[PDB]
Amino acid sequence: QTIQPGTGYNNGYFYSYWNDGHGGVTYTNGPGGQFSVNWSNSGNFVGGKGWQPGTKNKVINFSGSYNPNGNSYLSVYGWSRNPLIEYYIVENFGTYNPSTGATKLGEVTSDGSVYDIYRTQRVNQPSIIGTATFYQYWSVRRNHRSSGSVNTANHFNAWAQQGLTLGTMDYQIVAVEGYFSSGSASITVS
Ligand SMILES: NC(=[NH2+])NCCC[C@H](N)C(=O)O
Ligand code: NA
Ligand code: NA
Ligand code: NA
Ligand code: NA
Ligand code: NA
């Protein structure tokens, strides 16, 4: 169903839906690993489905329709603790590449494309443990897509060769993120 922000479990999968308090987002859980998000003039939000906790060797399957009109991402997205990390394997994005301004550290080839690798830092921002300073790890796919599989270990291995180490996994989902934009998406995870 359509829900307010929160986390939980639906039809065998973990879900997380977060927003910054602005209006405009409709997040709906569906059967199985399905979710839908429609946004009209949102602020910042993140929603999707997957697992609590994730693993360092999961092969994640996704498919569906992704139609951003402005700044948005479609990603494998999750967190670790000790160290506290927010990470992204970005499969598609709208008008804004999330790595803009960031220092490139390397490349990895996985699941039919090269990805470029970046680290960023978030200072005194929201996190899974409350306000915190933490690093973000990014793999950004050069060839955008709306369905496929992601061998997460290929990314996690490549990040570790640049000192981008992960802690104990927290959640791991396929997420749609938007930032002061509009769009529509409907995705099935497995
Ligand atoms: N990329 C983002 N917008 N991240 C939002 C993180 C939200 C954070 N985990 C919280 O529960 O407050
Ligand atoms: Na974007
Ligand atoms: Na995303
Ligand atoms: Na991949
Ligand atoms: Na995770
Ligand atoms: Na996200």
Side-chain angles (χ1 to χ4, degrees), residues 2-190:
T2 306
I3 59 162
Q4 304 293 306
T7 67
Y9 300 92
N10 179 255
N11 297 317
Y13 291 86
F14 179 72
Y15 68 85
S16 176
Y17 169 36
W18 173 87
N19 74 39
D20 68 357
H22 283 101
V25 185
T26 300
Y27 174 94
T28 308
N29 284 323
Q34 294 191 60
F35 68 95
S36 302
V37 194
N38 178 258
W39 64 113
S40 308
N41 307 309
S42 68
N44 192 203
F45 71 89
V46 177
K49 272 183 167 173
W51 299 270
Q52 175 64 291
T55 79
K56 293 188 181 168
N57 66 348
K58 196 172 301 288
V59 178
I60 299 173
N61 312 302
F62 66 102
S63 66
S65 291
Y66 177 61
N67 189 35
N69 303 117
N71 184 343
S72 171
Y73 321 138
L74 175 67
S75 316
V76 169
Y77 170 75
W79 292 77
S80 74
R81 294 172 184 247
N82 275 336
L84 179 68
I85 301 293
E86 182 183 38
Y87 66 81
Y88 292 80
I89 300 161
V90 182
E91 298 295 287
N92 206 333
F93 59 81
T95 55
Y96 174 68
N97 180 330
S99 70
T100 298
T103 293
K104 186 172 165 185
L105 305 175
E107 300 175 10
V108 57
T109 296
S110 194
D111 304 298
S113 186
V114 181
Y115 292 74
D116 297 293
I117 301 166
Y118 312 82
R119 187 183 77 179
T120 57
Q121 186 174 235
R122 298 279 290 157
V123 171
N124 199 80
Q125 298 295 352
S127 83
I128 59 165
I129 68 172
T131 302
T133 290
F134 53 94
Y135 295 118
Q136 308 173 298
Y137 305 163
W138 301 83
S139 278
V140 182
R141 195 178 171 93
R142 291 187 185 168
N143 309 350
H144 290 182
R145 67 182 180 163
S146 304
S147 62
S149 309
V150 171
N151 279 67
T152 62
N154 291 349
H155 295 279
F156 302 151
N157 173 251
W159 292 355
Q161 298 311 295
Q162 291 310 141
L164 308 182
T165 206
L166 286 165
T168 309
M169 298 304 244
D170 198 273
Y171 67 77
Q172 183 172 67
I173 62 173
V174 174
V176 173
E177 180 160 354
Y179 190 80
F180 292 84
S181 68
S182 294
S184 309
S186 184
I187 299 294
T188 297
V189 184
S190 60

